Amino acid sequence: GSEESELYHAQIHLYKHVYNFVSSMALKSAMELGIADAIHNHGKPMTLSELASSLKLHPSKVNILHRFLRLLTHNGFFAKTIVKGKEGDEEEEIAYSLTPPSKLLISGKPTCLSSIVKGALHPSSLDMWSSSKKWFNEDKEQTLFECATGESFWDFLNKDSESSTLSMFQDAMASDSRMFKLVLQENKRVFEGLESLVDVGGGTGGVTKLIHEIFPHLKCTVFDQPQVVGNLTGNENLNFVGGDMFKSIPSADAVLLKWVLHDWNDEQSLKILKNSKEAISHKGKDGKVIIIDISIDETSDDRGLTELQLDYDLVMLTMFLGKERTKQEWEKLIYDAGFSSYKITPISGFKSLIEVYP
Amino acid sequence: GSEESELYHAQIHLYKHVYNFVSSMALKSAMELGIADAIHNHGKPMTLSELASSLKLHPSKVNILHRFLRLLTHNGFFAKTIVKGKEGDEEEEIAYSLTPPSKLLISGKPTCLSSIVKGALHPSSLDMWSSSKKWFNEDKEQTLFECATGESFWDFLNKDSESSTLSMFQDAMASDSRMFKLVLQENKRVFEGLESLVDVGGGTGGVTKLIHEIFPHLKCTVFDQPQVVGNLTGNENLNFVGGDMFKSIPSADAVLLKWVLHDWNDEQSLKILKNSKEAISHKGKDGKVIIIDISIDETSDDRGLTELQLDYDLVMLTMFLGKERTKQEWEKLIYDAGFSSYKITPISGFKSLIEVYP
Numbered sequence: 001g002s003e004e005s006e007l008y009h010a011q012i013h014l015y016k017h018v019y020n021f022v023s024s025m026a027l028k029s030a031m032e033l034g035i036a037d038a039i040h041n042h043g044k045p046m047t048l049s050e051l052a053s054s055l056k057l058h059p060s061k062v063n064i065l066h067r068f069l070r071l072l073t074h075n076g077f078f079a080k081t082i083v084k085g086k087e088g089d090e091e092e093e094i095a096y097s098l099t100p101p102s103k104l105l106i107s108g109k110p111t112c113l114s115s116i117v118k119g120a121l122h123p124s125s126l127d128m129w130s131s132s133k134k135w136f137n138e139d140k141e142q143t144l145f146e147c148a149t150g151e152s153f154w155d156f157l158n159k160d161s162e163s164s165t166l167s168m169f170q171d172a173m174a175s176d177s178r179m180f181k182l183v184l185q186e187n188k189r190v191f192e193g194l195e196s197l198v199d200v201g202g203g204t205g206g207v208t209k210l211i212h213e214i215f216p217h218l219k220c221t222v223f224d225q226p227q228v229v230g231n232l233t234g235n236e237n238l239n240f241v242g243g244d245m246f247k248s249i250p251s252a253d254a255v256l257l258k259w260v261l262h263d264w265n266d267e268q269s270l271k272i273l274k275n276s277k278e279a280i281s282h283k284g285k286d287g288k289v290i291i292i293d294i295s296i297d298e299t300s301d302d303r304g305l306t307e308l309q310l311d312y313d314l315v316m317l318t319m320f321l322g323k324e325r326t327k328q329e330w331e332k333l334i335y336d337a338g339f340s341s342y343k344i345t346p347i348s349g350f351k352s353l354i355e356v357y358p
Numbered sequence: 359g360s361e362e363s364e365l366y367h368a369q370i371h372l373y374k375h376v377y378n379f380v381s382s383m384a385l386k387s388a389m390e391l392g393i394a395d396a397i398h399n400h401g402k403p404m405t406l407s408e409l410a411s412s413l414k415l416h417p418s419k420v421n422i423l424h425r426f427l428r429l430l431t432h433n434g435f436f437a438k439t440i441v442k443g444k445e446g447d448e449e450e451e452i453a454y455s456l457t458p459p460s461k462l463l464i465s466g467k468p469t470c471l472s473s474i475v476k477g478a479l480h481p482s483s484l485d486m487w488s489s490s491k492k493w494f495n496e497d498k499e500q501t502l503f504e505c506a507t508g509e510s511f512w513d514f515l516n517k518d519s520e521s522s523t524l525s526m527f528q529d530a531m532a533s534d535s536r537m538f539k540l541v542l543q544e545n546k547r548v549f550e551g552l553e554s555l556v557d558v559g560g561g562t563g564g565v566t567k568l569i570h571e572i573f574p575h576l577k578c579t580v581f582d583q584p585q586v587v588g589n590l591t592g593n594e595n596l597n598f599v600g601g602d603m604f605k606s607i608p609s610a611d612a613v614l615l616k617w618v619l620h621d622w623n624d625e626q627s628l629k630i631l632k633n634s635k636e637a638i639s640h641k642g643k644d645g646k647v648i649i650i651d652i653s654i655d656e657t658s659d660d661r662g663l664t665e666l667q668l669d670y671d672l673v674m675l676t677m678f679l680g681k682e683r684t685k686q687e688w689e690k691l692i693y694d695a696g697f698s699s700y701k702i703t704p705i706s707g708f709k710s711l712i713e714v715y716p
């Protein structure tokens with residue numbers, strides 16, 4: 001009946017999702033335009049003309065800059081303000097100021113995420129979607145990227161004709177790992193009362209080095225495969241140890257599992273977690289395991305956060321056929337391991353730091 | 359100080375925008391997968407397996423279907439439910455049901471928008487974004503599509519090697535104009551008390567035909583250029599008249615300006631509006647002008663709607679260098695024309711029907 005009526009808010013819901021990609025493209029444009037850097041360097045609200053002047057735009061592109069700015073401002077990446085104006089011409093003009101979100105676009109700052117936005121929205125990241133239909137209906141098990149190009153993402157980046165793309169990718173990854181320092185500074189409480197720590201899968205020690213920049217007195221042990229640690233000797237508080245995390249992990253007050261469980265199924269992840277609990281048993285109820293990975297909480301009140309996490313989960317699937325765990329999956333893993341409780345702390349926009357206790 | 363601290367919710371805001379495109383790709387996948395049609399045809403909640411069965415997916419793609427479904431469900435395009443299960447195997451399974459938004463994906467229904475979602479998210483609509491940086495920094499005034507391909511969007515669609523793309527585009531346009539019928543049925547109040555109506559730029563009469571399907575007694579006059587109307591004769595309530603809307607418009611109780619002012623600057627739009635007021639003067643304070651176009655209300659409480667409108671405005675700019683007016687621009691136009699008041703009614707998700715009064 002009147003149900004057939006009301007072209008509902010169903011139509012508006014449908015359309016908002018159809019055109020959501022635009023918000024991503026507008027943001028991408030803001031970083032490639034270097035708007036944040038221009039405003040930051042001006043050290044004061046910038047006018048449309050001043051900004052157009054700083055970007056050395058052709059007069060015909062000014063109105064395009066304006067359109068992108070209006071949308072970005074509405075989306076909270078810039079704040080509009082009012083300024084007077086020099087000379088006897090003109091009258092009253094609007095100026096633009098950065099906001100916390102856009103300040104993350106200021107290059108040369110430990111907080112700059114420009115490289116990640118550039119790569120996550122590079123043609124090599126997005127063009128494959130045109131092969132989505134063919135991807136669902138084929139008999140071949142492969143990533144969406146492989147279905148669209150015929151080669152894995154990694155092989156693509158390592159082609160001579162993709163030299164710059166690979167460097168773009170490694171810039172983003174290096175920038176991402178760098179953000180871990182911010183995580184440490186922002187959650188000192190987590191490592192504060194520790195005397196020792198073992199960085200599992202710590203490789204050559206890059207992560208423990210950041211850890212030391214914040215906690216120079218913490219005794220850290222970089223645990224990894226015999227071939228990775230090999231020679232590497234340390235200092236008073238730096239230690240390198242080789243072994244197999246599936247058999248055992250060096251004892252310490254805390255065990256760090258940074259982006260480790262991510263690459264393992266439940267069976268393998270449980271064994272690591274169990275060896276982790278055993279590596280801290282000596283410390284009793286004072287020991288702890290620190291997991292740094294993504295946790296998708298569907299029952300979360302922040303629908304937007306969960307959506308972003310799920311979005312990112314869909315990228316992992318299409319690009320690598322990878323996966324991220326939900327809060328539940330984590331809980332099942334944590335308790336199956338024998339731990340008593342746990343606490344999740346949101347970090348880096350949508351990642352999670354999990355404190356697990358015996 | 360501690361301001362430097364807090365990697366704020368700035369990071370989460372930044373990332374939510376980076377990955378917004380995923381929601382658009384997931385929706386696109388839902389339509390190409392024909393999920394809505396499969397559920398609709400089943401006439402009852404469908405299980406993951408049943409749905410995988412209906413789509414004839416290779417067993418390895420089932421888990422991919424599941425991942426897309428989880429995200430789409432979170433985004434409100436499907437609703438999760440619980441069903442029992444036949445035979446002695448199994449236990450308890452989740453089923454999926456459509457929601458108002460996904461029902462707009464059921465093909466063969468006057469409400470189907472599948473074709474629009476397909477085109478708006480086709481490679482020909484999205485791939486050009488890789489040329490955005492070059493587009494801002496060049497000296498040539500052209501659309502982003504022209505900058506990326508070297509040819510206008512229209513010329514592209516009319517190439518022999520793009521035969522199917524053009525038909526895809528015309529399917530969406532035909533589907534869009536068809537939705538106008540829903541607008542009429544949903545806003546009878548607007549045309550109810552009218553005796554006569556003049557459809558300006560009505561072409562060969564396609565719009566007046568839909569109008570008659572709902573108001574068979576309304577005397578309609580299809581006004582357009584002499585060459586367009588030409589021969590065309592009508593009936594008792596159908597009338598064809600040729601002329602120049604910039605010089606004058608046939609008198610009637612109401613003047614319909616459906617997607618007309620959109621293609622004209624303020625100077626030309628004002629003249630049309632003035633001729634429109636004169637075409638209804640005879641009816642006095644009872645006459646009205648009906649404008650069907652987009653109106654972007656920045657001060658609107660529905661931030662999401664404005665964003666969508668701005669998003670769509672950015673597509674018009676990149677694809678055609680076109681533009682949409684804001685509520686203010688409309689008000690300035692309406693009053694400069696001499697009208698007393700106006701009312702805006704939201705239609706088709708993000709469009710607007712404007713009632714203007716003398």
Ligand SMILES: Nc1ncnc2c1ncn2[C@@H]1O[C@H](CSCC[C@H](N)C(=O)O)[C@@H](O)[C@H]1O
Binds near residue numbers: 224259
């Ligand atoms: N059996 C095993 N025991 C210990 N480390 C192992 C292992 N098998 C693989 N690895 C290690 O797994 C590591 C994954 S890299 C994980 C990321 C890292 N913690 C960071 O912060 O960047 C590699 O360094 C690899 O050498």
Ligand SMILES: Nc1ncnc2c1ncn2[C@@H]1O[C@H](CSCC[C@H](N)C(=O)O)[C@@H](O)[C@H]1O
Binds near residue numbers: 586601604615618
């Ligand atoms: N001076 C003029 N007077 C009347 N119509 C004109 C005109 N110049 C152009 N047009 C008409 O402008 C129309 C734009 S098409 C507008 C869309 C139409 N009302 C719909 O509902 O689809 C064309 O049909 C064209 O013939």
Ligand SMILES: O=C1c2ccc(O)cc2O[C@H](O)[C@H]1c1ccc(O)cc1
Binds near residue numbers: 118168315
């Ligand atoms: O940061 C990311 C990213 C950065 C640059 C690039 O060119 C592609 C990308 O893909 C994703 O968008 C994302 C990513 C995250 C983790 C990972 O291991 C791989 C990619």
Ligand SMILES: O=C1c2ccc(O)cc2O[C@H](O)[C@H]1c1ccc(O)cc1
Binds near residue numbers: 473476478480
């Ligand atoms: O519906 C639209 C659309 C449909 C199919 C297609 O292949 C491209 C498109 O571009 C936009 O996404 C949108 C549009 C709207 C009005 C218009 O005049 C042109 C395009």
